[PDB]
């Protein structure tokens, strides 16, 4: 999570 | 691959702005107070990174693995990269311009426990001087650290990111022609600057060693680390050291 997150924004 | 004049005007576009570090300059400097606030100061930049490499032509057509594998490996060599670009364009490469509100002198350099790493760093930084790299070189440089490092077993779609490198290779050797030179001059400009990006690797293994003591010591030295430093650093960092990464080189 959390770099996964911002990757899929 | 992408017309010269346009692929500046794409990098120029989607550059990260200005990032502060949030750092109390009346506070007094302690190892761990700088320490603490480079973390904050990576933390702040990771996020700008991810937006960037986002927006990077190619990029997001790789598999979602893949692009989470390029950043979390590639980070330290693009964030410091462009502290060195800072402080050749702020303070002509005499401090380290980590940001307008942490700027490194040499007392700080002895303070932070890392001052021979410091030296490399402004080293690098000098090396923009002596080389007086243009903006638009430093542009293209940086998008190729993003394409830097991969796992040893390489990455999910192996092939893509092999071609897509070598464009971004190809766009640095094209804006450096661009630029008015024979081809003979072009030719020794485009080994100065790949030599230069390798000359990253050994900075950026140290520094990877580096953080990952001050990760096991975090606790004991006072020194924070943000959220997303720490899963990083926790997860690929050790990767690094266990020499489960290669760096793609030039020379
Ligand atoms: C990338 C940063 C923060 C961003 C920048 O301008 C370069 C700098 C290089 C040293 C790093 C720092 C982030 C935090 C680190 C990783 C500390 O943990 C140890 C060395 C630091």
Known sequence: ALLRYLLDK | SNAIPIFLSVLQSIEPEVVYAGYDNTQPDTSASLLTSLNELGERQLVRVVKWAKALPGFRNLHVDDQMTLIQYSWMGVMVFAMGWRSYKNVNSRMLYFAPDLVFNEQRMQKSTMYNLCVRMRHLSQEFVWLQVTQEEFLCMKALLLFSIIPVEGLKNQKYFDELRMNYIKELDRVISFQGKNPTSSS??????????????????????????????????????????????????????????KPLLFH
């Open chain 2, 188 to 245: 020794q400009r485009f080994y100065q600057l790949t030599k230069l990006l390798d000359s990253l690797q050994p900075i950026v293994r140290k520094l990877h060693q580096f953080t990952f003591d001050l990760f096991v010591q975090s606790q004991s030295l006072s020194v924070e680390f943000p959220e997303m430093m720490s899963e990083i650093i926790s997860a690929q960092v050790p990767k690094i050291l266990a020499g489960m990464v």
